[PDB]
């Protein structure tokens, strides 16, 4: 079984790997990532990140009921939230170009664009076409090369 | 800095405060703090702390299903865990002097020497007098005056 520090640094990459298939309508110089809700595997993230084009990914935690998640966040890494809390969040992102990703794989069905599954020998994820289309960012299809080859032994 | 960081740095401060009213059977040079489960406010802790008496608190995440929590852990800061996992956790803590604290002081009760309530303008916390005796650490009773 893979350790917490193993799975953290792993998530870090998968997110970078997802972020590669994503175009924002207006590309910021610093991409803004907001961690929202309790999380296990975001420690790696919050160090900050750099993309393969040198764009820094800046990372900070934000309150689930923060009403400006939408404008503060180009990315949101979503943790454990309850129905209401989840509602607040996905409402705040509407009309804004935001990439949403969950630590847990249940949430594709309720708002998140991507849903990690961190258990097992590899980090896997599934996606949802609905939330993706209404996201207002462009997601290249080949983002699924990554989940599939991750669901591979 | 955001309010989550603000509330995070404060959980730091509250944790230290509680630490001063606890003693362990055999005091370790370096206090082992296990953050366990999803945690909105444990980022200050993970950065590492130090007590006024100069002692270092080392903090690191450990998985919920981790069977050696009891030996690996001086203090455990319990995040989000379901009924099954909550049990799983406290069984490893059994018969070991482990200071148990929880981030959500509502859906918490079994174990959890202390349950924090981070919401509101300040951080508050209950104390679980039952859990406090069984645990195996010596908690000074003054601490209850810092409770609710």
UniProtKB/Swiss-Prot annotation, chain A:
Homodimer. Interacts with TpbB/YfiN. Interacts with YfiB. The YfiB-YfiR complex is a 2:2 heterotetramer. This is Negative regulator YfiR. It comes from the Bacteria. Disulfide bonds join 34-73, 108-115. Changing residue 73 to S: Does not affect folding of the protein. Cys-34 and Cys-73 form a disulfide bond in the oxidized form but maintain their free form in the non-oxidized YfiR structure. The Cys-145-Cys-152 disulfide bond is well formed in both structures. The Cys145-Cys152 disulfide bond, but not Cys-71-Cys-110, plays an important role in maintaining the correct folding of the protein. Negatively regulates the activity of the diguanylate cyclase TpbB/YfiN, leading to decreased c-di-GMP production. Inhibits TpbB/YfiN allosterically, through a hydrophobic interaction between the C-terminus of YfiR and a conserved region of the periplasmic PAS domain of TpbB/YfiN. Under reducing conditions, may also act as an YfiB-independent sensing device that is able to activate TpbB/YfiN in response to the redox status of the periplasm. It is found in: Periplasm. Keywords: Disulfide bond, Periplasm. Disruption phenotype: Deletion of the gene results in the generation of a small colony variant (SCV) morphology in PAO1. Mutant exhibits slow growth, reduced motility, a highly aggregative and wrinkled colony morphology, strong attachment to surfaces and strong, exopolysaccharide-dependent resistance to macrophage phagocytosis. The deletion mutant, although suffering from a tremendous growth disadvantage, shows characteristic persistence behavior under antibiotic selection and during prolonged infection in vivo. The keyword Disulfide bond applies. The gene is yfiR. One of its GO terms (cellular component) is periplasmic space. The keyword Cell membrane does not apply. TpbB/YfiN repression is released through an YfiB-dependent sequestration of YfiR to the outer membrane. Binds vitamin B6 (VB6) or L-Trp at the periphery of the dimer, and both VB6 and L-Trp are able to reduce biofilm formation induced by YfiB L43P mutant. However, VB6 or L-Trp alone may have little effects in interrupting the YfiB-YfiR interaction. GMP enhances the binding affinity between YfiB and YfiR. GMP binds at residues 23, 138, 140.
From Swiss-Prot, chain B:
It comes from the Bacteria. TpbB/YfiN repression is released through an YfiB-dependent sequestration of YfiR to the outer membrane. Binds vitamin B6 (VB6) or L-Trp at the periphery of the dimer, and both VB6 and L-Trp are able to reduce biofilm formation induced by YfiB L43P mutant. However, VB6 or L-Trp alone may have little effects in interrupting the YfiB-YfiR interaction. GMP enhances the binding affinity between YfiB and YfiR. Keywords: Disulfide bond, Periplasm. Cys-34 and Cys-73 form a disulfide bond in the oxidized form but maintain their free form in the non-oxidized YfiR structure. The Cys-145-Cys-152 disulfide bond is well formed in both structures. The Cys145-Cys152 disulfide bond, but not Cys-71-Cys-110, plays an important role in maintaining the correct folding of the protein. Disruption phenotype: Deletion of the gene results in the generation of a small colony variant (SCV) morphology in PAO1. Mutant exhibits slow growth, reduced motility, a highly aggregative and wrinkled colony morphology, strong attachment to surfaces and strong, exopolysaccharide-dependent resistance to macrophage phagocytosis. The deletion mutant, although suffering from a tremendous growth disadvantage, shows characteristic persistence behavior under antibiotic selection and during prolonged infection in vivo. It is found in: Periplasm. Transmembrane segments: none annotated. GMP binds at residues 23, 138, 140. GO terms for cellular component: periplasmic space. Disulfide bonds join 34-73, 108-115. Negatively regulates the activity of the diguanylate cyclase TpbB/YfiN, leading to decreased c-di-GMP production. Inhibits TpbB/YfiN allosterically, through a hydrophobic interaction between the C-terminus of YfiR and a conserved region of the periplasmic PAS domain of TpbB/YfiN. Under reducing conditions, may also act as an YfiB-independent sensing device that is able to activate TpbB/YfiN in response to the redox status of the periplasm. Homodimer. Interacts with TpbB/YfiN. Interacts with YfiB. The YfiB-YfiR complex is a 2:2 heterotetramer. This is Negative regulator YfiR. The lineage of its organism: Bacteria, Pseudomonadati, Pseudomonadota, Gammaproteobacteria, Pseudomonadales. The gene is yfiR. The chain holds residues 38 to 185 of 190 of the full protein.
């Amino acid at each position: 079984r893979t350790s917490i520090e193993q799975r953290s640094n792993a998530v870090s990459q998968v997110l970078l790997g997802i972020f590669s298939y994503v175009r924002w309508p207006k590309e910021p110089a610093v991409l803004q990532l907001c961690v929202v809700g309790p999380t296990e595997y975001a420690d790696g993230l919050l160090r900050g990140m750099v993309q393969a084009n040198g764009r820094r990914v800046h990372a900070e935690r934000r309150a689930v009921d923060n009403p400006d998640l939408g404008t503060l966040c180009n990315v949101i890494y979503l943790g454990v939230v309850d129905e209401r809390e989840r509602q607040q969040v996905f409402r705040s992102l509407a009309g804004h170009p935001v990439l949403s990703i969950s630590e847990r794989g249940t949430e594709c069905s309720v708002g998140s664009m991507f849903c990690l599954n961190v258990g097992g020998p590899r980090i896997t994820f599934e996606a949802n076409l609905d939330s993706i289309a209404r996201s207002g960012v462009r997601v290249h299809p080949s983002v699924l090369k990554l989940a599939r080859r991750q669901a591979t032994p």
